[PDB]
């Protein structure tokens, strides 16, 4: 069994938790009337998670989480992105502009209070945090240093309030080199086994009172109500593991047809188009370095969502994902019929036609998004400023647009040559001419092919070259700028996207209302304290054991990885698999200190049967005594379909061994200061 439970559901799980070997009370993990692990697990930069392990507000999270800060901080004269960063005193800890970290102080049941002021409307106000948390000050002393959070649970049958302390002075303490921070980021993405040291260190500051404060001299290290002491005594197969964090999004109550839409449209189209994108882009990178130092981030970001989508498809083909949801659908129907309530099948019937009604539109939407809006560069082309139709002020506006479209990281080369032609050609085959943007429709109709159309653009448009643009702004015409082929391509596609959004939003309300009804029946059947809701970026806990899995026949993945695995992957002619000289030296000297396993090997990562997803990156992984033993930073591709249905024998959370973390701080960095603060075991 799995699931992502609310902190209030701690009481119904403790029996099964202690059954796995947990030596903790339920009040240790959550206490509304006391200090607990709740006040030690924080949100980081909105989309990640962190944990305090200090007497002085020290924050542990992922490397790719705090990547933005380290990137800002890093230079040519001090490449922290390459060397890492290590503060040997509090005065060396660097401050970050606009960094927010939030701690939960109280979790409040507020379903009834919201349900009354709901009866008053687009039919989406009962789901949106836009309106829910606006009802917060009416119930609570309502803005000192806090933020009030109200979100929808169980499709809209529950509403909980999160009183939140919000820190704005979080300081970068330390980080490993990228060769350790994102080792294997290109091949080992969404993969197990894994040998990556994905971490980075921050600190929480508060004024003399200990309250959420802005960056100032006043600021003193925050002394937490509660923090998680680090345990470096080791981990073994079968050990109880506890993960707390802020998981982003799941779709636990998808019907048999919502799965199909999620399969045929959401993932398959993404796989199809991104596959073409990456095939071409890769080819052009292994032929001209200049392209590689630039299209790297774009290729990596695309390949990241691509591998997830085909991992999501793997659950459909091999794991019988849809059939499971169909079973669960029939059993709640059979339950409803036996009990004689009809507000269930109507909910299913309504969902079915909602998905049915928007099938053709969303396919057009995804093809436009994945195929053109993301892949094709021309979508950002400078559109005509509206006056052109002192005399008028937009000739100043369009080069401001040009030096944005053509500001930076865009290469007119590759688009022209294959990238746009390949994408548009496939888009043309998939979307009927009657349903594609008017610029593209006319373009292919006038030149016979999507190939010739793109060719016409770059031979007739202004923004096709740098020199051509300012050659043209020598004596600008107010006819050309209207009928410019690339400016029409960007405009028409954008308009088609805007149009597709509105026409499909008519199904947002019937779907959401039918879903709330459907979940309400399921919630009635299984009972709230036995059913975990979907993820909505709030504090959840999940538990399991440190266990590997059986990927296929005759193959078994272990639960723990070692430094040996790194050296087995070392390849100097691959930035992804480059091994840092000192790390290789430590491995040769076996200078692991006593951070090593019981068998002398140096631990790197381990995996557990916990249920994670979305933004649970940087989540603390705690042992049976409540002490920290690792940091979560990923999930295997075989468990991607866990966002729909948890996969017991395949889905695993990929965790950084906390002993490997300390090892880098100690044996690799030499920053003994942080070891003395973060007490291991």
User: Residues for the chain: how many in total?
Assistant: 681
Please give the residue whose beta carbon sits closest to Cl ion in the complex.
Answer: 234
- Give the strand pairing for 540-545 and 94-95: unpaired
In the complex, minimum distance from the CB of residue 244 to a copy of itself, in angstroms, rounded to a whole number = 26
- Rounded distance between C-alpha atoms, residue 611 and residue 380, angstroms: 39
Which of 313, 562, 623, 636 is the binder for Cl ion (CB under 5 A)?
A: 562
Query: What does 552 interact with, of a copy of itself, Cl ion, none (CB < 5 to 8 A by kind)?
Result: a copy of itself
Q: Are 556 and 550 in contact (CB under 8 A)?
A: yes
Output 234 or 544, the one with its CB closest to Cl ion.
Answer: 234
Q: Hey, is 100 helix, strand or coil? A: coil
Q: Are 194 and 634 in contact (CB under 8 A)?
A: yes
- Rounded distance between C-alpha atoms, residue 307 and residue 498, angstroms: 28
- Rounded distance between C-alpha atoms, residue 145 and residue 148, angstroms: 10
In the complex, minimum distance from the CB of residue 192 to a copy of itself, in angstroms, rounded to a whole number = 7
Q: Are 10 and 541 in contact (CB under 8 A)?
A: yes
Query: What does 42 interact with, of a copy of itself, Cl ion, none (CB < 5 to 8 A by kind)?
Result: none
In the complex, minimum distance from the CB of residue 188 to Cl ion, in angstroms, rounded to a whole number = 17
Contact residues: a copy of itself, CB under 8 A: 192-193, 195, 318, 548, 552-558, 560-562, 564-565, 568
In the complex, minimum distance from the CB of residue 564 to a copy of itself, in angstroms, rounded to a whole number = 5
- Rounded distance between C-alpha atoms, residue 236 and residue 435, angstroms: 58
State how far Cα 469 lies from the chain centre.
38
Query: What does 560 interact with, of a copy of itself, Cl ion, none (CB < 5 to 8 A by kind)?
Result: a copy of itself
Q: Are 199 and 631 in contact (CB under 8 A)?
A: yes
Output 345 or 570, the one with its CB closest to a copy of itself.
Answer: 570
Query: What does 533 interact with, of a copy of itself, Cl ion, none (CB < 5 to 8 A by kind)?
Result: none
Query: What does 598 interact with, of a copy of itself, Cl ion, none (CB < 5 to 8 A by kind)?
Result: Cl ion
Q: Which residues pair with 51 in a beta bridge?
A: 41, 60
Output 365 or 562, the one with its CB closest to Cl ion.
Answer: 562
Output 447 or 557, the one with its CB closest to a copy of itself.
Answer: 557
In the complex, minimum distance from the CB of residue 416 to a copy of itself, in angstroms, rounded to a whole number = 20
The contact mask relative to Cl ion for 597-636 (x = CB under 5 A, - = no) is xx--xx----------------------------------
Query: What does 234 interact with, of a copy of itself, Cl ion, none (CB < 5 to 8 A by kind)?
Result: Cl ion
Q: Which residues pair with 643 in a beta bridge?
A: none
- Rounded distance between C-alpha atoms, residue 461 and residue 321, angstroms: 48
Which one of 176-184, 230-238, 640-648, 652-660 is the stretch in contact with Cl ion (CB under 5 A)?
A: 230-238
What distance, in Å, lies between the first and last C-alpha atoms of the chain?
30
Count the Cβ atoms, other than its own, within 10 Å of residue 137: 11
Which of 101, 423, 563, 662 is the binder for Cl ion (CB under 5 A)?
A: 563
- Picking from 256, 246, 438, the residue whose alpha carbon sits closest to that of residue 351 is 256
In the complex, minimum distance from the CB of residue 605 to a copy of itself, in angstroms, rounded to a whole number = 8
In the complex, minimum distance from the CB of residue 596 to Cl ion, in angstroms, rounded to a whole number = 8
Output 490 or 546, the one with its CB closest to Cl ion.
Answer: 546
Which of 3, 234, 375, 548 is the binder for Cl ion (CB under 5 A)?
A: 234
In the complex, minimum distance from the CB of residue 584 to Cl ion, in angstroms, rounded to a whole number = 12
User: Exposed (0-12), middle (13-18) or buried (19+): which is 47, by Cβ within 10 Å?
Assistant: middle
Query: What does 349 interact with, of a copy of itself, Cl ion, none (CB < 5 to 8 A by kind)?
Result: none
- Picking from 310, 198, 258, 326, the residue whose alpha carbon sits closest to that of residue 534 is 258
Output 318 or 339, the one with its CB closest to a copy of itself.
Answer: 318
Query: Considering the rule CB under 5 A, would residue 420 count as an interface residue with Cl ion?
Result: no
Q: Hey, is 152 helix, strand or coil? A: strand
The contact mask relative to Cl ion for 568-597 (x = CB under 5 A, - = no) is -----------------------------x
In the complex, minimum distance from the CB of residue 352 to a copy of itself, in angstroms, rounded to a whole number = 30
Output 563 or 629, the one with its CB closest to a copy of itself.
Answer: 563
Output 192 or 543, the one with its CB closest to a copy of itself.
Answer: 192
Output 403 or 568, the one with its CB closest to a copy of itself.
Answer: 568
Output 7 or 546, the one with its CB closest to a copy of itself.
Answer: 546
Query: What does 510 interact with, of a copy of itself, Cl ion, none (CB < 5 to 8 A by kind)?
Result: none
Count the Cβ atoms, other than its own, within 10 Å of residue 20: 16
In the complex, minimum distance from the CB of residue 418 to a copy of itself, in angstroms, rounded to a whole number = 12
In the complex, minimum distance from the CB of residue 303 to a copy of itself, in angstroms, rounded to a whole number = 18
Cis peptide before 667 (omega within 30 of 0): no
Output 299 or 592, the one with its CB closest to Cl ion.
Answer: 592
- Picking from 624, 551, 631, 569, the residue whose alpha carbon sits closest to that of residue 21 is 624
| Cα R_g (the chain), whole angstroms | 27
- Rounded distance between C-alpha atoms, residue 51 and residue 30, angstroms: 15
**CB-based contacts of 452, cutoff 8 Å, min separation 6:** none
Output 131 or 557, the one with its CB closest to a copy of itself.
Answer: 557
In the complex, minimum distance from the CB of residue 417 to a copy of itself, in angstroms, rounded to a whole number = 15
- Rounded distance between C-alpha atoms, residue 29 and residue 15, angstroms: 14
**CB-based contacts of 2, cutoff 8 Å, min separation 6:** 542, 544, 609, 610, 611, 642, 646, 648, 651
- Give the strand pairing for 240-245 and 146-153: unpaired
Binding site for Cl ion (CB under 5 A): 234, 562-564, 597-598, 601-602
């Amino acid at each position: 069994d799995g699931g992502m439970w609310l902190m209030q559901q701690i009481n119904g799980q403790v029996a099964r938790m202690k059954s796995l070997g947990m030596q903790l009370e339920a009040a240790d993990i959550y206490n509304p009337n006391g200090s607990s692990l709740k006040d030690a697990v924080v949100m980081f930069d909105g989309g990640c998670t962190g944990v305090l392990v200090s007497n002085q507000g020290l924050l542990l999270t992922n490397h790719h989480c705090g990547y933005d800060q380290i990137q800002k901080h890093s230079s040519v004269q001090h490449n922290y992105l390459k060397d890492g960063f290590w503060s040997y005193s509090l005065a060396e800890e660097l401050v970050n502009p606009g960094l927010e970290v939030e701690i939960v102080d109280e979790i409040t049941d507020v379903t009834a209070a919201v349900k009354k002021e709901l009866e008053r409307p687009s039919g989406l106000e009962f789901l949106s945090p836009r309106y829910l948390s606006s009802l917060a000050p009416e119930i609570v002393a309502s803005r000192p240093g806090y933020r009030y959070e109200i979100k929808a649970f169980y499709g809209g049958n529950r509403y909980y309030m999160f009183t939140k302390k919000v820190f704005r002075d979080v300081r970068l303490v330390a980080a490993p080199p990228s060769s350790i921070g994102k080792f294997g980021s290109d091949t080992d993405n969404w993969a197990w086994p894994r040998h990556t040291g994905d971490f980075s260190i921050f600190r929480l500051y508060a004024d003399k009172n200990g309250n959420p404060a802005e960056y100032s001299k006043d600021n003193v290290p925050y002394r937490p109500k509660r923090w998680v002491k680090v345990n470096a005594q080791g981990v073994k197969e079968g050990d109880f593991a506890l993960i707390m964090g802020y998981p982003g999004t799941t779709y636990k109550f998808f019907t048999a047809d919502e799965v199909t839409e999620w399969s045929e449209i959401d993932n398959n189209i993404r796989i199809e188009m991104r596959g073409i994108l990456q095939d071409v882009m890769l080819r052009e990178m292994l032929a001209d370095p200049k392209i590689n130092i630039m299209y790297a981030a774009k290729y990596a970001s695309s390949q990241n969502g691509y591998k997830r989508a085909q991992g999501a498809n793997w659950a459909i083909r091999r794991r019988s994902l849809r059939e499971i949801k169909l079973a669960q659908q029939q059993e709640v129907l059979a339950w409803a019929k036996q009990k004689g309530i009809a507000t269930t099948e109507e909910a299913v019937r309504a969902i079915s036609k909602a998905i049915e009604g928007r099938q053709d539109l969303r396919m057009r939407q995804r093809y436009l998004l994945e195929g053109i809006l993301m892949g094709i560069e021309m979508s950002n082309a400078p559109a005509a400023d509206s006056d052109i139709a002192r005399r008028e002020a937009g000739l100043q506006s369009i080069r401001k647009q040009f030096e944005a479209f053509f500001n930076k990281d865009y290469s007119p080369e590759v688009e022209k040559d294959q990238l746009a032609i390949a994408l548009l050609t496939r888009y043309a085959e998939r979307i009927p001419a009657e349903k594609q943007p008017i610029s593209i429709r006319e373009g292919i109709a006038e030149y016979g092919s999507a190939k010739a159309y793109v060719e016409m653009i770059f031979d007739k448009s202004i923004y096709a070259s740098r020199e051509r643009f300012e050659e043209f702004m020598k004596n600008p015409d107010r006819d050309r700028l209207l009928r410019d082929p690339m400016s029409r391509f960007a405009a028409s596609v954008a308009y088609e996207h805007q149009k597709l959004a509105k026409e499909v939003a008519a199904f947002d309300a019937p779907l959401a209302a039918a879903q709330r009804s459907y979940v309400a029946s399921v919630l009635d059947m299984k009972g709230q304290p036995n059913l975990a809701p979907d993820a909505n970026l709030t504090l959840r806990f999940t538990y399991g054991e440190i266990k590997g899995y059986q990927p296929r026949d005759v193959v078994t993945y272990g639960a723990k990885s070692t430094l040996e695995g790194v050296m087995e992957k070392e390849d100097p002619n691959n930035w992804e698999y480059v091994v840092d000289p000192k790390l290789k030296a430590l491995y040769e000297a076996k200078n692991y200190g006593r951070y090593a396993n019981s068998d002398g090997s140096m631990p790197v990562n381990f995996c557990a049967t916990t249920h994670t997803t979305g933004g649970n990156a940087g989540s603390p992984v705690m042992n049976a005594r409540g002490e920290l033993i690792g940091l979560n930073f990923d999930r295997n591709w075989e468990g991607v379909g866990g966002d729909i249905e948890y996969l017991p024998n395949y889905q695993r959370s990929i965790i950084l061994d906390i002993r490997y973390l300390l090892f880098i701080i100690d044996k690799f960095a030499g920053c003994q200061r942080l070891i003395d603060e973060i007490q291991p075991q």
